[PDB]
Amino acid sequence: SLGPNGLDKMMVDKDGDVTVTNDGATILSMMDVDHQIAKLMVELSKSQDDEIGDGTTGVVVLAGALLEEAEQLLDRGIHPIRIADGYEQAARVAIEHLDKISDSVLVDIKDTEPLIQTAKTTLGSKVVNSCHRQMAEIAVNAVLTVADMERRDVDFELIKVEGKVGGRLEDTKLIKGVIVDKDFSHPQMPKKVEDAKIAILTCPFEPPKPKTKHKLDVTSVEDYKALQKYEKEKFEEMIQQIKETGANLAICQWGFDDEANHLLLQNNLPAVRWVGGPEIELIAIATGGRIVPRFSELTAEKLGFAGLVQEISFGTTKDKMLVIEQCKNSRAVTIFIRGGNKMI
Amino acid sequence: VNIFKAGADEERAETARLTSFIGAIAIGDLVKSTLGPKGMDKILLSSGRDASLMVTNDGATILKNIGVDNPAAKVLVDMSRVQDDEVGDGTTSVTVLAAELLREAESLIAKKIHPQTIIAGWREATKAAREALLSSAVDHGSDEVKFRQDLMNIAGTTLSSKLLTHHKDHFTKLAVEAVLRLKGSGNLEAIHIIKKLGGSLADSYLDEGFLLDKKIGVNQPKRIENAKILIANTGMDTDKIKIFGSRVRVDSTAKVAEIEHAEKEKMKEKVERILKHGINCFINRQLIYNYPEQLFGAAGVMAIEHADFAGVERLALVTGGEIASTFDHPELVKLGSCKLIEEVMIGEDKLIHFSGVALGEACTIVLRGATQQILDEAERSLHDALCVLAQTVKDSRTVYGGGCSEMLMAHAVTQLANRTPGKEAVAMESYAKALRMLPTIIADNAGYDSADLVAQLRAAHSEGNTTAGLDMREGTIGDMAILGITESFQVKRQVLLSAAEAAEVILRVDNIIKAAPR
Amino acid sequence: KGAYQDRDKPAQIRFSNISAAKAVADAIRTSLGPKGMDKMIQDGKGDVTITNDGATILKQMQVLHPAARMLVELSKAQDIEAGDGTTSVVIIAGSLLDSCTKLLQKGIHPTIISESFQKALEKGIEILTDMSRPVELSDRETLLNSATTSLNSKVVSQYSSLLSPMSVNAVMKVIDPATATSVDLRDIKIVKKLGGTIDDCELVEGLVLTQKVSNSGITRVEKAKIGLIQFCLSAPKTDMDNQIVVSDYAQMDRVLREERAYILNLVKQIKKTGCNVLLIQKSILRDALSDLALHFLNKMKIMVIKDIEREDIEFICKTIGTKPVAHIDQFTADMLGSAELAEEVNLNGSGKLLKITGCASPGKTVTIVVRGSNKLVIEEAERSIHDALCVIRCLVKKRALIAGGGAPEIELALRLTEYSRTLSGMESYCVRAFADAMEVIPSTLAENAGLNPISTVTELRNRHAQGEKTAGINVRKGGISNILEELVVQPLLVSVSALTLATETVRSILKIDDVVNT
Amino acid sequence: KGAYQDRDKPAQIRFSNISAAKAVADAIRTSLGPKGMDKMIQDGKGDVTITNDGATILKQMQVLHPAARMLVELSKAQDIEAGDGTTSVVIIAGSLLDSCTKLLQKGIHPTIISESFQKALEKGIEILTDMSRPVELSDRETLLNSATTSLNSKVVSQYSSLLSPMSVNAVMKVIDPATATSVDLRDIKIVKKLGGTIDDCELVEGLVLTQKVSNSGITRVEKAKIGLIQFCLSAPKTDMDNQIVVSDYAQMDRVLREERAYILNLVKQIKKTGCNVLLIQKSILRDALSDLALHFLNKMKIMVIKDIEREDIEFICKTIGTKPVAHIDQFTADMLGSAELAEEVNLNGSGKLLKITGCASPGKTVTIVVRGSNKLVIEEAERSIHDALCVIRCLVKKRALIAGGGAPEIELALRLTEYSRTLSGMESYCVRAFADAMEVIPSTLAENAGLNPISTVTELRNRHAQGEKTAGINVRKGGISNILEELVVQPLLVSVSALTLATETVRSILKIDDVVNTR
């Protein structure tokens, strides 16, 4: 497998799901083995993957070769411990020489050529070398955008790789925004808006209720009418408080009901619901807003800015998705992958 | 020494590609008998519960229904389903082309050619073929009559390989009309296909309005002139106040009687607020209970109970109203309009007929055959035709069908191969042979001299006549410009790219490791 | 010289389908015409049925071949479209498939056979239209003739003199015979009760209930004021959580007295409107009738009917002209149903039946009650009545009447053979086979009656060749005679639907070339 | 850039064959040299053997892999041609197959490997032949040294003082060292009987019989006249169907009298020739001895021995000098063997033997009798004596002698690696692998002796690189030293045949690329 001329491995799991992959870590991952040394080699590949993410097959092949030479040596009546000591000594020598041999490549956004070349080298031997040029560029740009250079740390939770079938591998792009597998509620509202002040929100558009168990006793028709008025004014005040901050778009994590959806429609304020927690956090980091847990503390300065939000249909099927692009400065990006197969 | 498991095995040699090739060829040979205007469909029978029976022609549902065992067969079925999702046509074509690519691949690897050499040759060949197809694509959309004729041709070529061919002249235009009612919106759910048994398949018609499979209430009228429809998504049931934790805790029966009277009065006032909009029709999403139905009947309006999300969405599209939930301000976004709400009977059932609709943004197609399987196949193939028509409305570029586009792109591959040295050239020649194997199959299923027809097409395309293909009603070499066997450019491009990609991904496996089943 | 067509599985599958269809047709061949005797079907559980309708025979019999399943779907579709001929359509389809098996053996492509069958059907529809005569309503004689013809091939034939006039009166008392264009059978409620004999069947212009009177003190009401109730006559309880707290000894007396006063108030408001018989909707989650409420109703000399199904409210309202109430404040005599008499009749110890008869308000609904010794004859009698009603529905749908007893299809066979003799080519044999495969019906009618099939069919062909149209098999004479003078006629829609549906399903069957297990 | 060779089945088959051959080799690798211990084989039935012979170890151990069967056949072929070194040959074959699996991993065609192996064989034959020295027979010292070297790695090593001189006496008493060019081992008859210890093995120039004398009145005969008999001493009976009819009362007495007279006449004809002991051949279908005949023979004071197998008559005639007699008229003293003494010897209550000693015409034939506590040690002593006899046979066949103790193969490994350093190309790696694949024998000689293998092999290579040839591993000294001074030598035929057979076997195995399971 190792090398640009290597060949893939196609594994089926215990349910009947096929994965055609070349990554040594993954290939060893679905390789169910009983022999203990095979388990140790699988753990070796997984650890090399976790520490680096590159050269998973290389370390496995190197360990196999080292053990084969060790076998040939101990055939000549030598202690295994001496073989291990020699291996460690030679590894020290090789590490020192590989320190001596190397050079450096400048890592800045101003010039992205050596980074692209290294990413291109890594992307070789994988099928995505069909393109092999634009995917390296998008990977480099994603890492450079997300990375916090002062701390010299890259947070992989700010990159949201998502794949959707259809199209071609040419469509694999880097959105400097966020994409979510949701859609605007109440399909009458517009499918797109221009630069929008977004109201990132968590609590649902429903009448409040304390977490502690409670019993609101209603004892007369006057109390019942007061309860009806309380419900109606709660909805109306909630919607007017959303509107008064100037937001053109709202996002709620926990979803809501019809009596809220019609109010959001009739006030020309689009919004989406049932957005996941990590999706909410990514939206907040991208659009620059702040997550607010209550309507009562939604100010003008807690909103985010979005260049444009779009509803995208994705072919003949009815799976609509929402994409947010052109933030003022997006520290979280999205990698979108498309193809003619699930396995690809 | 064996190390894996009990039930886990590994094929790390020619055995792996043997299994992959035989599975892909089995998929191709099963799907192959359903191409062209003369293809014959198949019966799918389930050996499990309910013994489901379905008569179908397209390869997508044939491949998805059967339980494939070989992983390569799973690859082909997934590719077919993905391609059906993307465009909705050419699933059989893409599966067949991939099968022939794998067949030529095993033939090449018999000649001791490294698989990566074949991969490079195929990449170059598909680049050249895609470039040639794009160069040969004709476009419309600026024109009005010519584009409508092109749409009719696309519907005809998409619908001629299915059962509706028996009445193709009637159906194609109908499908086109349906898409012409979408007004550019890529919303296929705006099309409703109601299938009722009884009568010939030529009794199918696209309605001049909308049809709803719901029921009027008890005391509401069953016919309206100059309808003013309000579409809502309110409760109209018991309609709890939604303040969880609210209960009546009183010390007399008079109190609870008063509270239930207050509940009924709040429901009455909600109905009054609804009626204040100035309506004579009312369509609700969820149920309408007995008291609101009685109030509606007394007022003199018409109410619809339990019209699901799709129903209210289609009514909003076809009438122009908004999905209301709160009726505080009737002065805001307004109602819809129609001209008749007559109840019309089809077969033995009654459906609400919205005629004289304000907008044509949605419509219904009534399918009426003589067998449930005929209804299912008509529905699936009509869905394919509508998918293709919507896709070509979104992107009006078209290329000629009948193998003409395939012949020209194979010719481009051959010309590229002739000028490339090494063992790449034989790889591209095999690519061209596999690509030309499609019109051969269409002629075979038709039953003509496939070799003679393909040789004639090769000569005509090498000479320069770039609009030559198979005339199947007579079985000769004709001109697709004059005849009018068009096809969507997007469909053919997706077929080519998906098939080449699946062949490339399958070909580069040299080890199949199967874990022990659950 | 020609295509080798190495694959032979399509031929095997086609012959298997044809053989299965022919076997299914032959299975019910002996259940056709007046002399055909019905089948007996017992399913997996120990339940039996004595069925002569082809749709029921085919549905109950759990077939396993795909051709058989397509045939049973064809039969049920023909029943839905027409309601009569569900045996003849299956017989025609199987017979002409058996005809086309030798066409397949003669070296003819299935597509040519399908197209030629379509052309033959096109000619046959025109032949049937020419053979017919106009039929117009208010002519009770021809309606009775059609009903008797529909009922002749059933067990209730000897009762047809006392069962067909009411069968056509049911339809004539529901729809206006001037501008109808369709009728509904939903508002023809067939109520079946065990006991008595068939000669005790009845047609009532009023309403029939299988419910029982709760207060066993009042049985008959003269000048009845019926009022539906949709709310509950029990202790009050709100939709949301209901609770009463008692803290003193006087509170128990207060709650008991208040509940009694509330119930008495409701019953007094019900009684003060002049309502003398009450109909309570079957309510769950709240007791529709309380024992105290029922006691008060009985005290004020009223008749109470409770546990009425929700889906029957529309039927009751359309019958007796009442309007449902869901709130006591809207219970007024201005919208209270009225009838001349309400009776509860014991059916000689076999059951208890409620009749609302003489409804002063107009009623566009009738009810048929069917009586029989055992349950099997009751089921077959209601099925036969349904067949006669469907025949009258066919007459209403399109006004065209043709002769029967084998005459239409034998005349069609002659005309289509003469048409095939002027169609030189490969389709001449196919049209000839279609023409000669529609002689199966007269042959079956001849052999089922004990006649000589060869001589009967030959004499029928000779008689129709001389232009003596509307000449067919007569089982009273035991030979061949003019059928119109024998008073046997059927609507044209049955024959046309049978022919068209059979041809379309046969073309669909011919399009099949493979079966695969999913 | 070359043939794809899609089918990986041949490579997998070759790797499987190499692995199986290596497994068989290193299974018995621990049974090499004067410090390698013998195995115990218990087959499916209730039979056990304690064996150090490589051929017998491989035969009894019923292997399954085809390559293992090829190796056991190679060992038995080497036993046929040489008789010693049947373990070193299989070790060499397995070791150099193990070396060539790496070559197969380096992308070298099997045909190239086979041809290079053949060329290395051709060079090694020359190296070994030049390394040796000519040897002349009738030199007791070199014969004794070779026999002791053959016997050292066997269980009878502690008895080498009593077995080597008799092992060389057996060979020297069969052939004439002037013009022999070969020796027939059939006339070295090995007889085994339970009892005693290995130290009571004996060599007799006479004849040894396991039969028992019919008459227990005479057992010791001095100046005996032995005569073989191939006819039956019973009542006369013709080949065709025979019947005697009696119709009188005198007929019974007459027929008994004629039978007695005929038997007595035969016995008198035998006796009048001076015959002193009688050897009666085993005759089925006709009792060669009757009660009347044995009675008469015992009356004439003679020794009678019966049940002599037909296959031993040639051995008896060649040993004591008698000639077979199938007719009474031909029985005379001119064809009657003679011996100085015939004895029935008791082995301290553990059986009985017949010994003919002092034959006046000593033929080219001797016999060896072995003594032991249990059956297993007796069988192992027989195998060791046979191996020593085969070593002397090889030394007689071609007169050439080489040093032992790892010297020949290590010197060949050197000379062949400097030969490989002159053949740069694709075959250089294969010839170097062949050269370094025969360092296994000295390595295992060092390992089984408890020495450090790596240092011992390094010192061996260094000392043969300095021209101090005939240097090898000494287990008495516990180090490395000159081998001829230690009196350890072996005939050139042993090593040359071992190398040639191993190389041929490997070249044949390397041509396999598939296996099919026949019905």
Ligand SMILES: Nc1ncnc2c1ncn2[C@@H]1O[C@H](COP(=O)(O)OP(=O)(O)O)[C@@H](O)[C@H]1O
């Ligand atoms: N009437 C026709 N004449 C000539 N070629 C046709 C005709 N209809 C379809 N084809 C060709 O047959 C191929 C497959 O058609 P079809 O079976 O409709 O595919 P699908 O089953 O995916 O709809 C298409 O590439 C098209 O070029």
Ligand SMILES: Nc1ncnc2c1ncn2[C@@H]1O[C@H](COP(=O)(O)OP(=O)(O)O)[C@@H](O)[C@H]1O
């Ligand atoms: N009295 C009759 N005399 C001659 N033929 C009849 C008579 N009654 C019915 N038939 C014929 O018997 C055929 C079968 O009719 P029937 O069994 O009633 O329903 P189905 O058509 O569903 O089998 C009809 O085609 C009709 O022409």
Ligand SMILES: Nc1ncnc2c1ncn2[C@@H]1O[C@H](COP(=O)(O)OP(=O)(O)O)[C@@H](O)[C@H]1O
């Ligand atoms: N006394 C000894 N000192 C060192 N090496 C010896 C001695 N005796 C035998 N050898 C070596 O042991 C090797 C194997 O001999 P042996 O085990 O007797 O026969 P086989 O190889 O058939 O088992 C010979 O090559 C010889 O060089």
Ligand SMILES: [Mg+2]
């Ligand atoms: Mg890598």
Ligand SMILES: [Mg+2]
């Ligand atoms: Mg199509």
Ligand SMILES: [Mg+2]
């Ligand atoms: Mg009938």
Ligand SMILES: [Mg+2]
């Ligand atoms: Mg030896």
